[PDB]
């Protein structure tokens, strides 16, 4: 699960 900005 990639961070919001990645």
């Amino acid at each position, epitope marked *: *699960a*990639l*961070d*919001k*900005w*990645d």
Partner: antibody
Amino acid sequence: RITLKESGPPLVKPTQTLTLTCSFSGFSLSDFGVGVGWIRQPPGKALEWLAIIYSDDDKRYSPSLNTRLTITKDTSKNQVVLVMTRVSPVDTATYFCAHRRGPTTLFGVPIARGPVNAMDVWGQGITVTISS
Amino acid sequence: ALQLTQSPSSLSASVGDRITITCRASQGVTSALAWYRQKPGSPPQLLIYDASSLESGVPSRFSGSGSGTEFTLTISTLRPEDFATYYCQQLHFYPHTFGGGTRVDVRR
């Protein structure tokens, strides 16, 4: 100047529901890409990430606590609420809420995402003891 | 999930020393890593964001470098207020993990 402060009950009994409120000033949860997260710290232990919510209302939770956490925001009151259900003694900890910057913008155009990589301002923290 | 291991877990030092704390991630986190210093009884305080950027108002003796899976925080000249516990935090993958912390105490 950004400041945050946690409030809620200092004592809670097992199986009960814990509602923690983060009231802040200096930014709005309607500002672009801003986030407010919650982190806890059992006495003598390491920091543990719990959840975060952004101004566009995306929410994310620790997978280990997902079923017991609800995070919500009240933009007009400048508050973020975290509700934890079915607490048990291991949930005794100091709970902190914190600000997360959104990308820097230039004439309302996102140009730098490096500032989102940190929780930059923290509240003093609220000690919560869980015991019957 | 993703693991963040700090080293050393504990470290002794004296005022004026140069110390360096390191944090290793189990999978690459690009540059999305932050360092904090937490003094007893207080909340953590942001020192370095995005692996190497100096947070505003933070003293220049603090420095951060690295990207991918290996990062380091170095305090070039330890001051009394630096006797504390330091933490690194990854923000590339959810959940946004914290390392185990490294305690820096007075050497004797």
